[PDB]
Amino acid sequence: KVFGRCELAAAMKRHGLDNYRGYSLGNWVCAAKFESNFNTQATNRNTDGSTDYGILQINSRWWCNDGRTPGSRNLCNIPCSALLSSDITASVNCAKKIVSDGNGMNAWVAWRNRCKGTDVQAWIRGCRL
Ligand SMILES: [Cl-]
């Protein structure tokens, strides 16, 4: 599924991400935009052979099992393919674990490089939340 901007903002809002660990909703929408372009089916292979999955490009190196990333972990205890649903619940639940961990949203490369330090409020402008 390719989410609309406000559609995704609303979904993230009702799943409790607004100001979760201090990260306002626009940060989460911005992260999803630059990770997956709002596409729940997005997958990308990393140089080390792990793969990023879904709307928030969750990495099999640490967070989910795909059975093809030797030595990796599965900290969200979930098959990576489960992070590709049209329903964002699994990705949000895993994201909340990731963001509470250590370096916060810096765990998402696209967030650090494209959202952090910018005015992210524009990402939720006009949305019915
Ligand atoms: Cl292994």
Curated annotation (Swiss-Prot):
Example of a GO MF term: lysozyme activity
Subcellular location: Secreted
Record's keyword terms, sorted: Allergen, Antimicrobial, Bacteriolytic enzyme, Disulfide bond, Glycosidase, Hydrolase, Secreted, Signal
Reaction it catalyzes: Hydrolysis of (1->4)-beta-linkages between N-acetylmuramic acid and N-acetyl-D-glucosamine residues in a peptidoglycan and between N-acetyl-D-glucosamine residues in chitodextrins
Active site, per annotation: E35, D52
The EC number(s) this enzyme carries: 3.2.1.17
Catalytic EC class: hydrolase
Gene Ontology terms: cellular component: cytoplasm; endoplasmic reticulum; extracellular space
Positions that bind substrate: D101
Main location: secreted
SMART domains: LYZ1
Tissue specificity statement from the Swiss-Prot or TrEMBL entry: In the egg white and polymorphonuclear leukocytes.
A single GO BP: defense response to Gram-negative bacterium
Disulfide topology: C6-C127, C30-C115, C64-C80, C76-C94
C-type lysozyme domain span: 1-129
Job of this protein: Lysozymes have primarily a bacteriolytic function; those in tissues and body fluids are associated with the monocyte-macrophage system and enhance the activity of immunoagents. Has bacteriolytic activity against M.luteus.
Miscellaneous section: Lysozyme C is capable of both hydrolysis and transglycosylation; it also shows a slight esterase activity. It acts rapidly on both peptide-substituted and unsubstituted peptidoglycan, and slowly on chitin oligosaccharides.
Entry similarity comment: Belongs to the glycosyl hydrolase 22 family.
Subunit structure: Monomer.
Protein name: Lysozyme C
Source species: Gallus gallus
Recorded name of the encoding gene: LYZ
